[PDB]
Structure formats: structure tokens, C-alpha cells
């Protein structure tokens, strides 16, 4: 049918590394206003992560070049660097606004399992965090607050509906800790959240699923890696 066709097209685009087309295919599935399968949520998440991740990488490269030129004072170059950075910031805003609109109009309203609700509020936290990463002043404070509110909603559902070993719950704890570290400049709160999620998983390692034990284990190493980076 149409839904299986769009999923197949998403998988072809993924193999071909044509992530715009992957996004467009999974947006059409999301627009059907149905509960996505695990596989469909994962394809949607990978598509947007690749499309935004190319611009986040470009932004950090351009920003690094800008610092270097600020240290040499090359003013001709800085006008061009700043205008190029601003063009990438425009694309980051458009991509984040696209998935955020899909989450608000289709995915969050059709979500009817604890897993799917945590997944979608977490993704909303992630995309407002990406809006906050490169933002200044008011725009940064507004993105940071929207991000924080979505991560709290995800955390509330995750704490009541998912075991502490669930990879969506661990992946939420990882990204939320990163939010506290990078966006709110709070290493203490970042460390507390990451250590608490790690310790709660250790306490109930009997809740590890055959389906996701290696995902859970990887995310628990990433929590430990942040703690290594932050302490």
C-alpha cells in the first residue's frame, strides 16, 4: 500500500544517502495521522538527524573559521564569513521548524503509547535545543524554555511508563543532560541528571530487553563519556 511504499522509498533514500528524500518520504507517513511503528519512528528520526547534522557540522566549521579570522583581524573576510554563517543559521531554523511543525500537527496528537510520547517529546526537546545552540539573546532564551518544557514532559512520561533501562528513556536522559550542560551552562545539573539516569539503569539491569540491550549499553557508555568530559 501507500504507507509500505513510502517506507520502502525512505529506506532506498537512506541507502542512497539522499536524506532530503528520506525526510520527504517519512513526513508523508507522519502526515497520515497514525501511530508510527518503531521502524517508522527510527527512519523519521535518522532522516532529520542527517539533514540537520550536515548544517550543524557546517555551522561549527564556519564559526571556527570566524574565530581564527577575528584573531588575525581580517575584516574583508569576516563580513563574508558572518554572512555565510547566517545563511546556515537560516537553514537550521527552517529544518527545526519543519520537524517541530510535524511533531505538533501530526505525531504528538496521534501518539498513543508511552514509548511514542516519550520519543516525540524528546525529539521536540532536541529540535528546540538545536534552535538554541547557535542563538543569542531573546531567541536563545525562548528556544531554551521550549526545549526545557518538552524534555520535562518526556521525563514525566518516561519516569512513569518506561523502565530506567529503556533506550528511549536513557536517550532522553543523555540529551537532556547535554541540554543542561550546553544550553543552560549548568555542569552541576547536567552531571546530576546523567549520573542519576546511569545509576537507576544499573539498579534495574534485570529490566534490560533482548530487543534493545546493546542500544541501552551504548547509551549508558555515552552517559559515562559525558561525565568523563564534564568532571
Amino acid at each position: 500500500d501507500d504507507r509500505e511504499d513510502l517506507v520502502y522509498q525512505a529506506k532506498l533514500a537512506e541507502q542512497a544517502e539522499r536524506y532530503d528524500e528520506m525526510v520527504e518520504s517519512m513526513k508523508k507517513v507522519a502526515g497520515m495521522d497514525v501511530e508510527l511503528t518503531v521502524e517508522e519512528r527510527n527512519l523519521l528520526s535518522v532522516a532529520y538527524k542527517n539533514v540537520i547534522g550536515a548544517r550543524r557540522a557546517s555551522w561549527r566549521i564556519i564559526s571556527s573559521i570566524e574565530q581564527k579570522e577575528e584573531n588575525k583581524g581580517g575584516e574583508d573576510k569576516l563580513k563574508m564569513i558572518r554572512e555565510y554563517r547566517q545563511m546556515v543559521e537560516t537553514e537550521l531554523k527552517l529544518i527545526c521548524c519543519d520537524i517541530l511543525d510535524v511533531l505538533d500537527k501530526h505525531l504528538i496528537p496521534a501518539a498513543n503509547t508511552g514509548e511514542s510520547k516519550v520519543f516525540y517529546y524528546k525529539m521536540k526537546g532536541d529540535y528546540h535545543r538545536y534552535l538554541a545552540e547557535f542563538a543569542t539573546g531573546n531567541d536563545r532564551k525562548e528556544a531554551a524554555e521550549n526545549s526545557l518544557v518538552a524534555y520535562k514532559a518526556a521525563s514525566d512520561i518516561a519516569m512513569t511508563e518506561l523502565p530506567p533501562t529503556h533506550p528511549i528513556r536513557l536517550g532522553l536522559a543523555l540529551n537532556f543532560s547535554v541540554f543542561y550542560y550546553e544550553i543552560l551552562n549548568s555542569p552541576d545539573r547536567a552531571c546530576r541528571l546523567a549520573k542519576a539516569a546511569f545509576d537507576d539503569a544499573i539498579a534495574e539491569l534485570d529490566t534490560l530487553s533482548e530487543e534493545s540491550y546493546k542500544d541501552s549499553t551504548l547509551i549508558m557508555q555515552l552517559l559515562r563519556d559525558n561525565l568523563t568530559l564534564w568532571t
Binding site: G53, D126, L174, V178, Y181, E182, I219, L222, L229, W230
Partner: peptide, 8 residues
């Protein structure tokens, strides 16, 4: 420069 890892 980044001193954090997120889900990827």
C-alpha cells in the same frame, strides 16, 4: 568546541 555527546 564541543565537550558533550548526544544520541546519534
Amino acid at each position: 568546541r564541543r565537550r558533550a555527546v548526544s544520541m546519534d
